[PDB]
Amino acid sequence: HMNVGEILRHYAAGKRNFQHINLQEIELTNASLTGADLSYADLRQTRLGKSNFSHTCLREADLSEAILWGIDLSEADLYRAILREADLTGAKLVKTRLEEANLIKASLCGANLNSANLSRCLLFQADLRPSSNQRTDLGYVLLTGADLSYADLRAASLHHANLDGAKLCRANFGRTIQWGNLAADLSGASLQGADLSYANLESAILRKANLQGADLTGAILKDAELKGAIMPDGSIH
Secondary structure, eight states: OOOHHHHHHHHHTTOOBOTTOBOTTOBOTTOBOTTOBOTTOBOTTOBOTTOBOTTOBOTTOBOTTOBOTTOBOTTOBOTTOBOTTOBOTTOBOTTOBOTTOBOTTOBOTTOBOTTOBOTTOBOTTOBOSOOSSOOOBOTTOBOTTOBOTTOBOTTOBOTTOBOTTOBOTTOBOOOBTTTTTBOOBOTTOBOTTOBOTTOBOTTOBOTTOBOTTOBOTTOBOTTOBOTTOBOTTSOBO
């Protein structure tokens, strides 16, 4: 049941073990707790904008409805963490470990998720459209077996992303007029056995993407860039 001065004093003193601590609603904007162990901690509705939580342990922590805009979570371990409806707009999520995390209704607009591990995460209705500053970067992200049903990925960059076995039902990979009319760019991505049914792939860039075994039932593929893509049947477009 800990306040700002308490945690800042303890961390300054060299304390790193904050497992299970209740920090609900705390404000730590612009501050650093880098390397702290916050496994199993309660960070719900915290205000952590622009803070430095790089290399933190946040295994199975609860950050539901937290304000995490522009947070640095690079290389943090968020294994099975709960980030339901968290605001991660413009967050740095480079090599962040988010395996089996709950990101339902989260905003990740303009976040950098380069090489992040979101294997088997829940991303139902998440917002991954551009922020006012940049498109969302999911280069080399692992989204294997994740569920992104209804997620909004317009203009997202997904170069070499792994979406194998992912559920992408009704996900939006189209252009956004707000951001240069850029479509989602899945160049070189793998979507083997993915469920793309009813997904919007209009003008999506699918060059050299692997769609083998994927379900395209009802998907909108009008004007998609398919050159070199492996089609569901294994043929090369």
